[PDB]
Symmetry: D2
Subunit: 332 residues, 4 copies
Amino acid sequence: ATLKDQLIYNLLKEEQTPQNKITVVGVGAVGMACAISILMKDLADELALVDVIEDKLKGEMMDLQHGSLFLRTPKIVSGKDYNVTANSKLVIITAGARQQEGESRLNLVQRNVNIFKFIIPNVVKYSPNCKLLIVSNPVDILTYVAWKISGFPKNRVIGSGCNLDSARFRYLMGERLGVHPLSCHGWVLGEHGDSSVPVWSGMNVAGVSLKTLHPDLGTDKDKEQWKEVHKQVVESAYEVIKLKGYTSWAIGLSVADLAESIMKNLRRVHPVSTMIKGLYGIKDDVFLSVPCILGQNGISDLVKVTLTSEEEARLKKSADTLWGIQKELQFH
Amino acid sequence: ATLKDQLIYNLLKEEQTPQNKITVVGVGAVGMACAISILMKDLADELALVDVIEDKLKGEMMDLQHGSLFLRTPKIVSGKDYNVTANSKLVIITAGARQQEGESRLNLVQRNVNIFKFIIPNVVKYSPNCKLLIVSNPVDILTYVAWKISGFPKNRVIGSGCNLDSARFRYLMGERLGVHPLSCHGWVLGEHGDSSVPVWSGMNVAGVSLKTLHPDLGTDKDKEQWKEVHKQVVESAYEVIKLKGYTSWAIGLSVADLAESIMKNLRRVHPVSTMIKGLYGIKDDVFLSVPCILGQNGISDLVKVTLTSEEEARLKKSADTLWGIQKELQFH
Amino acid sequence: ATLKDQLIYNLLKEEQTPQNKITVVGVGAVGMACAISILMKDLADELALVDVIEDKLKGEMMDLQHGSLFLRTPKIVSGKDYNVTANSKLVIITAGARQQEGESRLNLVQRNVNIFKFIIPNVVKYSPNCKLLIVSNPVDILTYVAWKISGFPKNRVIGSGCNLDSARFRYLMGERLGVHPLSCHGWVLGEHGDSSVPVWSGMNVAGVSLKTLHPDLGTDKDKEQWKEVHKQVVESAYEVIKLKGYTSWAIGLSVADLAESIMKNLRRVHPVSTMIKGLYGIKDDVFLSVPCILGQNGISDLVKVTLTSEEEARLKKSADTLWGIQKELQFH
Amino acid sequence: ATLKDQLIYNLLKEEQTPQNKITVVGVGAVGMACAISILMKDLADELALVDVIEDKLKGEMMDLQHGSLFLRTPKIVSGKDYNVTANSKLVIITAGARQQEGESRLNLVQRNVNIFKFIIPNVVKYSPNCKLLIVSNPVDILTYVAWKISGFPKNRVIGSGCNLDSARFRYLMGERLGVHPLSCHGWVLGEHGDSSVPVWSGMNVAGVSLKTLHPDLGTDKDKEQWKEVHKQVVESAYEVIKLKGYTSWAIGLSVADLAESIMKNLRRVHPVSTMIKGLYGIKDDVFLSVPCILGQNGISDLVKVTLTSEEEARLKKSADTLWGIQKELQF
Ligand SMILES: COc1ncc(-c2ccc3c(Nc4cccc(C(=O)O)c4)c(S(N)(=O)=O)cnc3c2)c(OC)n1
Ligand SMILES: COc1ncc(-c2ccc3c(Nc4cccc(C(=O)O)c4)c(S(N)(=O)=O)cnc3c2)c(OC)n1
Ligand SMILES: COc1ncc(-c2ccc3c(Nc4cccc(C(=O)O)c4)c(S(N)(=O)=O)cnc3c2)c(OC)n1
Ligand SMILES: COc1ncc(-c2ccc3c(Nc4cccc(C(=O)O)c4)c(S(N)(=O)=O)cnc3c2)c(OC)n1
């Protein structure tokens, strides 16, 4: 006469093939920041955590599990084996190779490719219809890798791209103008990293172009040196790592926001990393960050931003560089 | 004129006194997990971080700031100087001594005393009307310590106590019964730790006493061994720490929940650590966890839970140990 | 081409199929209150409204649409035709007959049945796998009716039952005690309306039985007349209606809560109207409120509250009243 | 020993002012839509309702209170007496007179003046440091009227103005583009209603300007007739009132949104009605919607939009019009 049976009359066996499942792969600082941000935004009804560090994984699962009372996400699960990711709508990849000391860039990427050779086909094995959000760096290359390896079409392979950079850019713009980042508008596009392009033309508060008001905006002869806002944006992770060891919170919140649009089919515009063969004269299979319309089918549409000859040329060289690295990769 | 000034006409520069300020002291895993939990429950319009480790501190402030666009808490600040804590409604203390192994428990607590000797007066100096929430372990003792130093009335010196213990209990009650923990009710009370008391009489679902349904509940002769549920509660922070190195997420979510009741004046009942001289035949100046009505002035009232003789003894022995340590502390 | 085509490049013209769609039938005060509350708890990616009064339905739909910028439900539709309700996960029925002075209680029910005879098969035509949440009054009878007409299994046909009854009961308990209704616990069960049963035995705060503490709780020799609290609960709708005309807000919030559990698979326990044939010595196909576990499959399990024979007699009496009314109803 | 004696040990009370109190005046559809939206965005620890029908008031207070368990706002109060409003941080005024069939524009705003002479003094009496948010129409004038009667600094007297007009604009712009309104940007400014101004130059998505991409946009010759997006915004309340009797939900959300900025000090930029004597030729004490920075002190700063001479003219004509009415008023 077990106590559960005395208390509760069961009415229904049925399995629970879950309806709004998100999986996070990799439980480091970035991964778990993505996890807590997702849980606290009530975006998913089952969350799956996957890593190879078995004891650390289990710790992070239990710790979240213990906060269940303060959450609205009834099922939290974890494991090294990818069957715990089955039927995910969205799979967020934070996993990668850790940096070796004298290691060439290619080699770092190659070793990420070797890891993705194992992860990605396990992810598609269990969630054939999911969306892949790649966070792992270098993100515009690793999004190409997940694309190639998965074979998913381009709308369901998304890189976190410059989504965060644009966030930092707005924060900083805000703190100059004394106005909330929500009301300060501006776009960092192209390659996530040192070569990202701050589109000055597009910066506005309430539709009032900063570029028109201050024509020297973004340039050398700019006496307010607004390019330092960009320099800050690019330097930002470095300085944060220099200070606290890693970064986590910002990238967590940023990925949670991309998930919001996807999981709730919002059709919001985010600058994320997407295939752009065809656009800006770029002829290579290369992912770059461009404002995209995000929804239940991933990237459904993208926004053709008017770019200058100068800004177009930046994007083209980012692609040249990326391809140069991408064509020395080994997938077999 | 500047760009700022061609774009924005200022009507009044005028001083901000902040209106719902929360300060968090100590930016290790526990402290930051409280800070992210609070940012995401929009409980505060200003969040101040304080620690002595300046690199870590600036790093965390910058990282949170960088996700501002995704938050509705417009000012985040930090510093080693408690002037940044000014006019806080609530001050959460996670700071403490690093354990030294060898160390007697007494000496460990005395070093915490000496830290609080510096911290607590600075806090009250800058936010004389705040509520203090102590999270630092050993929490039932350190809440007494903060009270004796602050000279605040007991209603505004609150230990996080068995709030999380009780959430763990309910999560576990939950996975056994197949019901969300929000709907599983049971209270861990008394000393936060080994000696905590699981009040079986109070364990219910939909107001059905489990103890009346299965009288063996919480006894050696219990066939379903529900006593193991309490054992898992007692040992979770050990099991999680052993597995992932620290604990953070559950405590953060837990402490944000206390902060919600305080900041929004809800007068909900949480089991937190407070002065119980008088209750359950306790004669000494001891804090322990009892269900308390939390609101804008902190603890307004406490619930007189009926305990068995056995439970009342467990609790009294608890206060006797707590007093055995406290009577050996050095304040002046 | 056009502006849209110049701005936005399209990767993908899109299947549709909304993933978390909710339909509200009837756009009176109760329906719109349910709708606004659902929209503000970010529970659905598509909201569909259905009434017979065309101008009203379109005006409300437009009004909601114009707040789209402050919400997160990208698609809001309406129509006379149930084709706007396709692929709903939850269809919430508020529709019913307007009372006519001097009409018997039976003819009122029948007229409601003639409506359901049109509505229910349309709801299943287009959402064969939805859950039905009936709100229309009399709720326990009209739940049975929807159950019969739909042919759905019983787990997927739910009446709002004594859900709000117990909210009001908790609110009142709260005023008396000085404590948020969240921390006061009490269940009103059975037939929604004059014969509902306040289960004194289960009333607690912090898991302390008010009944044990105050043995006369709920009797006529009760010095504190706690019996009045239930009478307040039973009579509140009348009293609000008398003051403002209808009730709307509290019912809407109570419906949004039940959707939250269903749409998010929470498995929280709510006192809702379900089929209790086989309990409390009841052999008739009858629906009454009893505490139920709500999830993505609707009512998966239910709680067996222990009732005193007085309490058990009221449920049995209601089961006879209801059936003697139901056996007279006309459908097939 | 009561039950309460047996169950609750009580501690020495300390006193309690409410910390984030919002008052809403007038509990027709618009008042209550504002009330439920504020309740559901956890913006206050206390909500006060005030009107003149005691029955409707007590009913809406009870019906709300009954859903307390599902909310995080622990005190809801109502009454004809303005002391239920004491210590409000923000007072939202939806009260006013319905224009009657045979009634001029001058007598309407004069009746509203007289009603405001009763309400506003009472509001400042019990809550002298509040921000007033005027929602009542004709709003750009009544905002001016609240200002005059309260004697508040211009920063604490805010009119809802084109905050909803802009949101409707963005919804409609959204429908055409297949993009959510959050990501669609366009601003409606000036006198609320038929004479509002849609700033076509500022319309964008991800910072790509629509007017540069499609120079006819908003002119008549425009083959896609984008001008009708604004015309729709102008005739939306009319079209909805026609269809359901009134407008409530949209305005309610719009107002909560302004309330979120004020109550949480966000310094977000909302097109709201403010005293813009000094800009655009305007040399009169007139309130029109400009984009404004809203925080805890109300309107701290404002954005100087670059306007066409034609857009400038519409504002200036509005300002004349309004002063032409305000000068006949008597306080
Ligand atoms: C043959 O089966 C197979 N199993 C696991 C993996 C594999 C490897 C690394 C992973 C990997 N990272 C990892 C593991 C070990 C060393 C290093 C390093 O710094 O070089 C990096 C992760 S991660 N980043 O922890 O989420 C998650 N999953 C991983 C899975 C694999 O890939 C090469 N192949
Ligand atoms: C009166 O001068 C004075 N100033 C600061 C402190 C003082 C000491 C430790 C603090 C202290 N902790 C502490 C001490 C020693 C080592 C470590 C560590 O993390 O490794 C940490 C903290 S905190 N928040 O835990 O980081 C915060 N504030 C502190 C302040 C003090 O107490 C000794 N006395
Ligand atoms: C088979 O054809 C058919 N079409 C529509 C209806 C029908 C009737 C009332 C509805 C009905 N109520 C209604 C309509 C007209 C009069 C009255 C009254 O009793 O005063 C009540 C609703 S409603 N407003 O959403 O509750 C929604 N849908 C309804 C649909 C129907 O019902 C018998 N049958
Ligand atoms: C001098 O005493 C005095 N008491 C109340 C009022 C007064 C008037 C209208 C109010 C008023 N409007 C109102 C009241 C009665 C009738 C009508 C109508 O046009 O049919 C309009 C409201 S309101 N709009 O309901 O929130 C709220 N409070 C009001 C208060 C007053 O104004 C002249 N003067």
